[PDB]
């Protein structure tokens, strides 16, 4: 299959990826791009595995993984990234997600979510005890 010299690496790889897409589309989607499920952003999902105004009270027993999944919600949007992306980027470097560090569950913490369905309007509000 090494035949065309000085073919750009993008043109080679896209040509394979687009070939797969065109075959998968014909076989499993009746050759109609409208039936392809859409998400905000595709990535981040580890291979291991509808309430508008929620409330979440952390405890000392609170499981860190279930905690974050709850804050993030089911829909893939800016909130889902904020709470489940392990790393963010400062210019080109890759640093520990500071939102996750800050929301790390501890006694007294209380997360009010408001407009949790409309991702544009969603406001997450962490309240802690401050002078009682």
């Amino acid at each position: 299959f090494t035949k065309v010299i000085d073919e750009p690496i993008k043109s080679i790889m896209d040509g394979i990826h687009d070939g797969h897409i065109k075959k998968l589309l014909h076989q499993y989607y009746g050759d109609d791009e409208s039936k392809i499920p859409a998400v905000e952003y595709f990535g981040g999902e580890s291979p291991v595995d509808s309430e508008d105004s929620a409330v979440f009270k952390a405890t000392s027993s609170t499981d860190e993984e279930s905690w974050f999944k709850a804050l993030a919600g089911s829909e893939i949007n800016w909130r889902h990234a904020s709470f489940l992306c392990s790393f963010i980027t400062q210019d080109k470097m890759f640093v520990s997600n500071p939102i996750r560090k800050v929301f790390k569950p501890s006694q007294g913490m209380v997360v009010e979510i408001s407009n949790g369905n409309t991702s544009s309007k969603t406001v997450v509000t962490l309240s802690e005890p401050v002078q009682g």
């Binding site: 690496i9 790889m13 394979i16 990826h17 797969h20 897409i21 998968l24 589309l25 499993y28 989607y29 791009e33 392809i36 499920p37 859409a38 998400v39 905000e40 952003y41 595709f42 990535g43 981040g44 999902e45 580890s46 291979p47």
Partner: peptide, 29 residues
Amino acid sequence: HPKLIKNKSGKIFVETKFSKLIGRPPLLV
């Protein structure tokens, strides 16, 4: 089963256990 998915930007990905982690097509050099 390999699936198709697309961004909000309308870019179609082949969706496998691998591409789902890295958010890029499941082809590596």
